[PDB]
């Protein structure tokens, strides 16, 4: 299902990192 990138940036911000939509599922990434 089409992934929200804007939400995943601010959700991964809690960990300290950026969220990417990979295969339309979110991943907080080390970059």
User: Could you state, in order of their start, the residue ranges of all structural domains in the chain?
Assistant: 1-31
Structural contact between residues 15 and 28, judged by C-beta atoms closer than 8 angstroms: yes
Sequence-distant (≥ 6) Cβ neighbours of residue 22 within 8 angstroms? none
CA torsion, points 7, 12, 13, 17, in degrees to nearest 10? -130
Distance (Å, whole) CA 17 – CA 10: 9
The 10 Å Cβ neighbour count of residue 31 is 5
Method of determination is NMR
CA torsion, points 22, 28, 9, 4, in degrees to nearest 10? 30
């Amino acid at each position: 299902a089409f992934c929200n990138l804007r939400r995943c940036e601010l959700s991964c911000r809690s960990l300290g990192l950026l969220g990417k939509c990979i295969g339309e599922e979110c991943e907080c990434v080390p970059y």
